[PDB]
């Protein structure tokens, strides 16, 4: 977990020149690893409008086995859409009333990161029976 | 005509242009609320 | 996963259920049931049963440990 | 293009100039007459904010910078907005000290202040060692 983020953080803003490790990183069976790279394709792709992210980031999301993954995908919306935070409700509205928790947990820190710091009162229209859950 | 031939040759190319380009984002909100709402339904049904 | 949770639901029948007898209906999906072992339970009921037919009275059949209407 | 340049309007002309990828149209419709000098003003946020290449986008960015070198006061905006994207250090240091050199210690003052809060680590550590060369 302490080489999970370290390298994810040993690429920042490279926008093409991590896919080789952006890939492997994915394909591997340690669910600790390719939680790594959804760190690391936040990090690569900061501030950018990639179609090419938002795909493959949240294929994932949707997809994959383990939990904790499901959120590190989820928990990484914000960090390549904050420059323009009118997508951010339009995108994590509807993940944020999944089935399980771990998707519901990454789509509330998602709003938190993405509308950093803004008067936005739409990621706050979705926040209010987020914090009125059932789960803890 | 300063505009007039202004208007008819390199604003007509972007009238024409946004126009479609309005058509297509009018007919996907329309599909994508038509996904959303199915979402919903099998949703609620497995939460419950 | 919607598969999965009609599964579940439909393979919590096929048991050895045990046999007591309705007895009365608080609201919606939960009752009084008394067993045939004598000790009357308050459990849950579940949603698959059509309602009609728990008059006051029906033999009923009642999972082992959750002890629900089954 | 033509036509565009008989519009008199040449938002008009800089929106296929950078369709088509040519730069020597996007630099005459910003060195014509003096129609609204500050139309760079308008290609920077065109550059900053919808651009999604980065492979011509410090090109353009940097065929900006030729127009901002060769208008009459150079040191304002032009650094900060596109030579820290650009990421050249030693250009920084060298028209920095040239600001020094005519005795005006007033707006480089002003435009150390601007980088040191927007540029980040090891492009300030690269300027300052061409600092003291």
């Given at each position: 977990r302490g080489l999970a983020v370290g390298i994810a953080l040993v690429m920042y803003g490279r926008m093409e020149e991590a896919d080789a490790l952006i890939e492997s990183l994915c394909r591997?069976?340690?669910?600790?690893?390719?939680?790594?790279?959804?760190?690391?394709?936040?990090?690569?792709?900061?501030?950018?409008?990639?179609?090419?992210?938002?795909?493959?980031?949240?294929?994932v999301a949707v997809s994959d086995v383990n939990d904790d993954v499901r959120r590190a995908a989820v928990e990484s919306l914000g960090f390549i859409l904050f420059r323009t935070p009118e997508q951010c409700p339009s995108v994590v509205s509807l993940l944020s009333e999944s089935y399980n928790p771990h998707v519901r947990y990454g789509a509330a820190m998602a709003l938190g990161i993405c509308c950093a710091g803004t008067g936005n009162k739409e990621a706050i229209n979705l926040l209010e029976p987020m914090t009125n859950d059932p789960v803890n | 005509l300063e505009e007039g031939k202004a208007g008819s040759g390199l604003r007509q190319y972007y009238l024409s242009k946004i126009e479609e380009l309005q058509l297509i984002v009018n007919d996907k909100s329309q599909n994508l609320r038509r996904l959303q709402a199915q979402r919903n339904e099998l949703n609620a049904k497995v939460r419950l | 996963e919607?598969?999965?949770?009609?599964?579940?639901?439909?393979?919590?029948?096929?048991?050895?259920?045990?046999?007591?007898?309705?007895?009365?209906?608080?609201?919606?999906?939960?009752?009084?049931?008394?067993?045939?072992?004598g000790s009357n339970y308050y459990v849950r009921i579940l949603s698959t049963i059509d309602r009609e037919?728990?008059?006051?009275?029906?033999?009923?059949?009642?999972?082992?440990?959750?002890?629900?209407?089954? | 293009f033509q036509r565009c340049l008989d519009d008199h309007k040449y938002k008009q002309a800089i929106g296929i100039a950078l369709e088509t990828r040519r730069l020597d149209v996007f630099e005459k419709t910003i060195l014509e007459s003096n129609?609204?000098?500050?139309?760079?003003?308008?290609?920077?946020?065109?550059?900053?904010?919808?651009m999604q290449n980065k492979q011509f986008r410090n090109k353009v960015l940097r065929v900006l910078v030729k127009i901002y070198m060769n208008l009459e006061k150079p040191d304002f905006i032009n650094v900060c907005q596109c030579l820290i994207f650009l990421d050249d250090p030693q250009a920084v240091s060298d028209i920095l000290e040239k600001l020094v050199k005519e005795d005006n210690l007033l707006m480089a003052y002003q435009i150390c202040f601007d980088l040191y809060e927007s540029a980040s680590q090891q492009f300030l550590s690269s300027v300052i060692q061409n600092l003291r060369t």
């Open positions: 591997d069976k340690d669910p600790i690893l390719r939680r790594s790279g959804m760190y690391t394709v936040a990090m690569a792709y900061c501030g950018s409008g990639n179609n090419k992210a938002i795909r493959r980031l949240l294929h | - | 919607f598969l999965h949770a009609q599964e579940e639901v439909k393979r919590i029948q096929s048991i050895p259920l045990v046999i007591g007898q309705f007895l009365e209906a608080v609201d919606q999906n939960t009752a009084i049931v008394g067993s045939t072992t037919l728990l008059k006051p009275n029906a033999s009923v059949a009642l999972h082992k440990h959750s002890n629900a209407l089954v | 129609d609204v000098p500050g139309m760079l003003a308008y290609s920077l946020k065109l550059c900053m904010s919808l």
